[PDB]
Structure 1
C-alpha cells in the first residue's frame, strides 16, 4: 500500500473532481454533490463519517494528503465478473441463463442511458456467439472480463 509519482499527479486530477470550488479542501457539502452525481444518496452523518475516517488534523474537511491515505489504503482492485453477470440476470425473465437478442435490444434501447439500435447491433453481434439469436450472458460476461 505504497504509491508512485505518476499516480500522485493522477490522483491530483482526481482531487479536483471532488474539490468543486478549488480551495484545496473537500467538505461534506462537496462530497454530497459528487456522491449524488454518482446516483447515491449519503445522509449527513454518512458524509461526516467518510470525512472523519481520513481526517488526520480533524479540522472537518479532507485535504489532498488525507485524500492519498484513503487511496493508499485501498489500491487493490477486484474482478467484476460476478456482479456484471448479476446485472444481466436482472433481465433473464425465466432465469434460464439466456436473454434473447430481441429482449436485449428492448432493454438497451429503453432503459438507463440507452444505446442506439446501431450500438446494440454491435453489442449483440459480439454477445450472440452461437448466432442463434440468444445471449448466454454468463459466457458473454466472461469474454468481456477475460
Structure 2
C-alpha cells in the first residue's frame, strides 16, 4: 500500500531527510547519527532508551529502503497536500471560503458505517480554531503534511 500513493517528490523529500540524519554519509543511520542530529537541532537531553526505541521499530540496519518502508507503513492512508485540498475543494464546490462545522460532522458520520463521534470530537480539538472559524481546510492540509505547530 506504501509504494502505491507515494510519488517521486515525496520519496526525494524522504531521501534528503535521511541524508540529513545520516551523519557519517555511510548509507545506514544508527544511534550515533540520531544523537548528533538531535544535538544539532538543540536537543542535548537525549537518553539511550529513546534512541533505542526509535531503532527497535526496524528488524535490520535502517538503510534507505528499510526507512522508506517503515515510514510508508505508518502513513498507509496519507496523501500529499494538493490531493487532500482537492477533496475539500469538491466539498467547497462554489469556491474560495471553506466549509462549516455541522456540514462535515454529518458527512463524516453519515454515508458508510462510521467516522466515529469519538474521532470527530478529537478532530475539532486537534483541528481547532481552524475547524471553528472557516473549518480552515487550507490550514488543516498544511498541519497534516507540515506538522502541528505550523
Q: TM-score, normalised by structure 1?
A: 0.46
Greater C-alpha Rg: 1
Q: Which has the higher strand share?
A: 1
Q: TM-score, normalised by structure 2?
A: 0.45
